[PDB]
Amino acid sequence: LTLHYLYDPLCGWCYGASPLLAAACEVTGLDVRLHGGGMMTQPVGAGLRHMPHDLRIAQLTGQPFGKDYFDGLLRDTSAVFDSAPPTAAVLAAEALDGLGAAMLARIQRAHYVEGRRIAERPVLLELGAELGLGEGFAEAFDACSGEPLRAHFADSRRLMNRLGAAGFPTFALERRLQVLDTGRYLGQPDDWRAFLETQLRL
Ligand SMILES: *SC[C@H](NC(=O)CC[C@H](N)C(=O)O)C(=O)NCC(=O)O
Numbered sequence: 001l002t003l004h005y006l007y008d009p010l011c012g013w014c015y016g017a018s019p020l021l022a023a024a025c026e027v028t029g030l031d032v033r034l035h036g037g038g039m040m041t042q043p044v045g046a047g048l049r050h051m052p053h054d055l056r057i058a059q060l061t062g063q064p065f066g067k068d069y070f071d072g073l074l075r076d077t078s079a080v081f082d083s084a085p086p087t088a089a090v091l092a093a094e095a096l097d098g099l100g101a102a103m104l105a106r107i108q109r110a111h112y113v114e115g116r117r118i119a120e121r122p123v124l125l126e127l128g129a130e131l132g133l134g135e136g137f138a139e140a141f142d143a144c145s146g147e148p149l150r151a152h153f154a155d156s157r158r159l160m161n162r163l164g165a166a167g168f169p170t171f172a173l174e175r176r177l178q179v180l181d182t183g184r185y186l187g188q189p190d191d192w193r194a195f196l197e198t199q200l201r202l
Pocket of ligand 1: 011012166168183
């Protein structure tokens with residue numbers, strides 16, 4: 001039984017679903033695969049900022065948003081919302097140490113809580129070194145940024161296409177593929193964990 005997670009690091013609703021990914025990774029016997037879809041492959045300014053989701057995500061999921069994000073990053077004209085570098089960091093963390101899910105959660109915290117520029121290589125290398133990957137992560141990240149990332153995006157978008165999935169977050173359970181009702185479980189990680197346990201029982 002495999003849980004496929006189609007995500008994008010710059011998708012606010014994926015951050016709202018971060019507790020669901022964390023809860024899923026605690027279910028014994030359940031395999032979890034990450035699929036980055038490449039949502040933004042935008043400079044920060046008038047167009048990118050026009051946020052009203054974010055406070056709604058916080059109301060629904062309890063996920064925190066930091067002042068350095070609201071009043072720092074989203075106000076920084078020279079920041080770029082690029083989904084490719086953070087996705088390559090997730091790929092590299094998974095390739096090096098099987099820490100893809102942990103790296104995605106850390107990336108989202110760096111962006112939404114800390115207001116860091118997750119599209120920049122030094123920030124992603126700093127996050128990898130925080131997770132204890134400083135030996136080899138730089139080379140793995142640069143390697144994953146090229147043709148591995150491109151192939152990963154193409155694979156993810158073909159999966160989205162076959163499932164009729166319009167966007168992120170999207171969870172699909174493979175036993176045969178079944179897309180799950182993620183909106184039902186937003187803000188309910190304990191319900192979500194029990195649902196995945198109940199699927200193993202059935
Ligand atoms: S965060 C990027 C967008 N995600 C959603 O709109 C999800 C909606 C919530 N899950 C919900 O309504 O409960 C997105 O993917 N938009 C379409 C796109 O492909 O850009």
